[PDB]
Swiss-Prot record:
Pfam families linked to this entry: HMA
The protein, known as: Copper chaperone ATX1
Residues at which Cu(+) binds: C14, C17
Compartments where located: Cytoplasm
Family per record: Belongs to the ATX1 family.
Organism field: Saccharomyces cerevisiae (strain ATCC 204508 / S288c) (Baker's yeast)
PROSITE patterns cross-referenced by the UniProt entry: HMA_1, HMA_2
Activity regulation summary: Tetrathiomolybdate directly and reversibly down-regulates copper delivery to secreted metalloenzymes.
InterPro entries xref list: Copper_transport_ATOX1-like, Heavy-metal-associated_CS, HMA_dom, HMA_dom_sf
Primary location: cytoplasm
GO BP annotation list: cellular response to oxidative stress; copper ion transport; intracellular iron ion homeostasis
GO molecular function, one term: copper chaperone activity
UniProt function note: Copper homeostasis factor that specifically transports copper to the secretory pathway for incorporation into copper enzymes destined for the cell surface or extracellular milieu. Shuttles copper to the transport ATPase CCC2 on a post-Golgi vesicle for eventual targeting to the cell-surface high-affinity iron uptake protein FET3. Protects against oxygen toxicity.
Length: 72
């Protein structure tokens, strides 16, 4: 199956916010292969076989502001 690369600008200028994002992604193992969170750029990179819309909805349901997303 394709391992897609999604990138999101997520506002994580808040205590616990990067961890909230990590957590929802851990629940989607074993079909999430890699995640990167950069506080220097406020970016979350997700490498996964799962659909974009599903990753986006799960990140949004953390209540953290998702400014934009891309498939790369």
């Amino acid at each position: 199956a394709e391992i897609k690369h999604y990138q999101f600008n997520v506002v994580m200028t808040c205590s616990g916010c990067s961890g909230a994002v990590n957590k929802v992604l851990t629940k989607l193992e074993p079909d999430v292969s890699k995640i990167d969170i950069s506080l220097e750029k406020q970016l979350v990179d997700v490498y996964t076989t799962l659909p974009y819309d599903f990753i986006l909805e799960k990140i949004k349901k953390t209540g953290k502001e998702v400014r934009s997303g891309k498939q790369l």
